[PDB]
Amino acid sequence: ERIKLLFKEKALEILMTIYYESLGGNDVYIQYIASKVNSPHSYVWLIIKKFEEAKMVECELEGRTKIIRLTDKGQKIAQQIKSIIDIMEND
Amino acid sequence: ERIKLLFKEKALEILMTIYYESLGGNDVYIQYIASKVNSPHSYVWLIIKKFEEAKMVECELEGRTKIIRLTDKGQKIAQQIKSIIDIMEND
Numbered sequence A, B: 001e002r003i004k005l006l007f008k009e010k011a012l013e014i015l016m017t018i019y020y021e022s023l024g025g026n027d028v029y030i031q032y033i034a035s036k037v038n039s040p041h042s043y044v045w046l047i048i049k050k051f052e053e054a055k056m057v058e059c060e061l062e063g064r065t066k067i068i069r070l071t072d073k074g075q076k077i078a079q080q081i082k083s084i085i086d087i088m089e090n091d
Ligand SMILES: [Cl-]
Pocket: A025, A026, A027
């Protein structure tokens, strides 16, 4: 909510979902991101393409499965956002 | 624009305006923030109140002049956003 004050909530949760899922050791599937966030599949896809345009993620097809990975740039950004979230939540 | 992808552009520019103005040594006046950002005075005031609620700024009246200052919390957040902006702009 203080988060909504500064961030686009939907795009943020997509980015951080990719971050935590990859950090945990999972290949990140677009379907998985959808199950975790409050957006329809088509909206997730749209945001992923925007991230790709911004050189923050790369995606590739493995058969019928879309896999998303953070670029070094996307990773740094997610890490910094993680700290902002921490700071915002700690009074 | 990649900024708009993740951030609320209007709130962001208000926060960073406070950050750079204070860093330069100015008392930050609400009127000044308005001259720098693309928002009407009343919208700036609304955002400032939200920041105040989030304990990121404090404001006070000096006569008829509203002065805004970042709290330690607001300062840390602005600093982290500064790095994100830098990262986003450097390919
Ligand atoms: Cl992997």
